């Protein structure tokens, strides 16, 4: 929210952004039931809702096919992909031997119960048990003697009410071959994401932030298919865990440094251009700039791609050939005119005799710029016009 100009290196630093760092994963195990429609009074009489049960049967068939084909590829964010391997590994342990049998026994009366694992990692298990409450209790005697769909008019519509979830989730799993990079509203719904995150191994600090940004919590969580066991669907979903909630963080945006006299445009050029954050008194650097997303003030980051840089690297802001920490900066004359879109302003460097000036879109081209790097903010100007490539500036103020 507060940017300063580093005229020594033609760089800007913005220092008003807190951060939230992801640390772990909170596994949840889902157990949905499809009822008893595998073989229940089909016969051969065409009807309207009979064409809805065969859809459920085909959903079961495709859910079995995709589950069988899931264990065929296992023949021995990019930085977040290291977590996909862990999610695959944890699913393999649960799906084998009789761990599911113990899991199923754990929820034989209660829809929610925390269950352990063979490796001791705590895992949460949930069961909906809603479809069986209608297909077995409110549908069994209605369809009798194969005389289908005639002695009712309201329950015909209500059958599609308790059918959307299974169809949607089986379509998703068949399309994505088991791995779902997004937690859709079909797999997990509301009252199962404020309840299945409030049992995470963290403190009261980050849980409130997760409850407020459940949207991006969904955005960063992925699920996998465990398998089909009898008339039941088994699958699990991974939830991100945020270790810290509020640590100082800042951005660095670089550009060509300067020019030199006697017609020799020879200066330096920084290639730092990232974010920094602190975890345990040791600032960590993300080598890429497309690694974190700003949501107001806070910054959301994952502690699986950042690089820890040794302290005393603090004085990369002062570039006087410092001896303590050699900041990694590329060398080369190679003048390239460019404009760096800084958050609260703009950084401009044009050298090769190209006209550069600012424009507020109402006063016109006023205050023509100079050859050297100058700082233009989004209040003294609104655009930085070069040729016909007018650049806009953000409306956020700080």
């Amino acid at each position: 929210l507060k940017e300063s100009y580093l005229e020594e290196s033609c760089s800007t630093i913005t220092e008003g952004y807190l951060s939230v760092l992801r640390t772990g994963w909170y596994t949840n195990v889902f157990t949905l039931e499809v009822g008893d429609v595998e073989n229940l009074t089909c016969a051969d009489g065409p009807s309207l809702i009979k064409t809805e049960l065969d859809l459920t049967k085909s959903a079961l068939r495709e859910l079995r096919t995709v589950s069988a084909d899931q264990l065929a590829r296992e023949e021995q964010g990019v930085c977040t992909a290291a977590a996909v391997t862990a999610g695959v590994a944890i699913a393999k342990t649960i799906r084998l031997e009789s761990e599911v049998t113990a899991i199923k026994n754990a929820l034989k009366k209660t829809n929610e119960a925390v269950s352990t694992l063979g490796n001791g990692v705590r895992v949460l298990a949930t069961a909906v048990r809603e479809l069986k409450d209608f297909v077995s209790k409110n549908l069994t005697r209605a369809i009798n003697k194969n005389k289908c769909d005639i002695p009712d008019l309201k329950m015909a519509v209500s059958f599609s009410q308790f059918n959307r979830r299974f169809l949607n989730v089986v379509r998703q799993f068949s399309d994505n071959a088991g791995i779902t990079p997004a937690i859709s509203l079909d797999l997990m719904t509301d009252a199962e994401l404020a309840r299945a995150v409030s049992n995470m191994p963290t403190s009261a600090g980050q849980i409130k932030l997760m409850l407020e940004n459940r949207a991006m919590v969904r955005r960063k969580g992925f699920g996998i298919l465990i398998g089909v066991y009898g008339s039941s669907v088994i699958y699990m979903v991974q939830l991100p865990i945020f270790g810290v909630i509020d640590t100082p963080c800042w951005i660095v945006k670089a550009a060509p440094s300067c020019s030199e006299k006697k017609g020799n445009y020879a200066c330096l050029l920084r290639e730092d251009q990232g974010w920094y954050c602190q975890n345990a008194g040791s600032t960590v650097y993300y080598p890429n700039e497309k690694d974190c997303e700003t949501r107001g003030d806070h910054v959301f980051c994952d502690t699986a791609c950042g690089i820890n840089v040794a302290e005393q690297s603090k004085e990369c802001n002062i570039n006087i050939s410092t001896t303590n920490y050699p900041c990694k900066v590329s060398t080369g004359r190679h003048p390239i005119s460019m404009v760096a879109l800084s958050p609260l302003g703009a950084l401009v460097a044009c050298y090769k005799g190209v006209s550069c000036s600012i424009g507020s879109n109402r006063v016109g081209i006023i205050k023509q710029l100079n050859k050297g790097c100058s700082y233009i903010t989004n209040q003294d100007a609104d655009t930085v016009t070069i040729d016909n490539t007018v650049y806009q500036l953000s409306k956020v103020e700080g």
Partner: antibody
Amino acid sequence: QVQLQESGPGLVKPSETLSLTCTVSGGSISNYYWNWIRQPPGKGLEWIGYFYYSGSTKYNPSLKSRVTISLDMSKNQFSLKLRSVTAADTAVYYCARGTMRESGMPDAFDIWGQGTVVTVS
Amino acid sequence: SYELIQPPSVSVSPGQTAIITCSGNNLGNKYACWYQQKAGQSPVMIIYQDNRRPSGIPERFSGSNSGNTATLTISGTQAMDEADYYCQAWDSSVVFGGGTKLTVLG
């Protein structure tokens, strides 16, 4: 208590080289900015330059070619040397301690000295 | 270069909240800190980063930063302080304010 003590001459003839020295008791570590602040009569504070623990100098841009700031870490002290001193440079000189890493890195002056008066005649 | 311009005198009745404006050009974009210098003695820091308070300063010493004016607020002023409150905002030159003389009327 990382106290500051500034000492030196007190009377410099014009067109000579004033010298001063601030001695720190409690650690001149590579964690604080060591800067000189002067206040001419009329009570307007002016900043001359700061000294970081490594070679890192940055002076007031109306006062370059005249000010030199060095380090004497062996005795835990740092000095200064003006040049072409004139009657306009009669001021009380302070040596102060600055923290780091909350604004660009440079941040505000945590503790100051006691102030030695320097007169030119 | 740049110059932080602030009023040179502020008269405050005892027990009433005091506000000292420090009008820079592009302020709020950069961090601003304040100082307190009683007569004779060397100055001592009061506020830094516009909201913080380093060590031992009484709670009735707060600041803000909005638009182009950073304001120092003293809630319930007393006769104990009649210092010279300067500003500071690093623009590669450490521009200082012109100084503001609080008068609690003695």
